[PDB]
């Protein structure tokens, strides 16, 4: 929630944001969460994708990723 914590979450997102877009696809969400210490598996990742991929293009934004990590850490 703090600025220091938000930057660290941003570092994990920017590491696997290949095409310099503001998005990550399924595989990049898995390694990003694992880079933050969460051993997420395929059923959990697909559940998160379908919850946040509103336009249905296979990508989620950073603010989507920020809210995911917010739910995981604060709980």
């Amino acid at each position: 929630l703090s600025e220091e914590q938000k930057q660290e979450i941003k570092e994990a997102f920017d590491l696997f944001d290949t095409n310099k877009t503001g998005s990550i696809d399924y595989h990049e969400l898995k390694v990003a969460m694992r880079a933050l210490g969460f051993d997420v598996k395929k059923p959990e990742i697909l559940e998160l994708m379908n919850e946040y991929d509103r336009e249905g293009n296979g990508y989620i934004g950073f603010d989507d990723f920020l809210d995911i990590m917010t739910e995981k850490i604060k709980n």
Copy 2:
């Protein structure tokens, strides 16, 4: 451990310091060590808590976490 290494250990601790208490409980220690690349399981984590939770309240400080990562890395 150098200043650069200690800062990185500090970043992993501050990420899972949920209430800014300067302390982490069992679950927060587990994900923090895994955030540093160590796949730790429940028996090892409980053994670390029992070693460093001297007050017996279910929390350890950063200097407890710093010493844990010191022996795991060095």
Copy 3:
């Protein structure tokens, strides 16, 4: 790979640079890659070591590690 992505890869290498050399051994490569979200196993790590430990002393450099992570993140 942007300059900020290379800094994050450098942080993972420097965390397990135990003796302040420019090298990591088998075990230090395993945890360094796992610190970046890749849960690699023994056969893959030994495969990467054999490819990049050209001198054959059980160590690889940062530029070896940077190239490994470049291939992993860019599929």
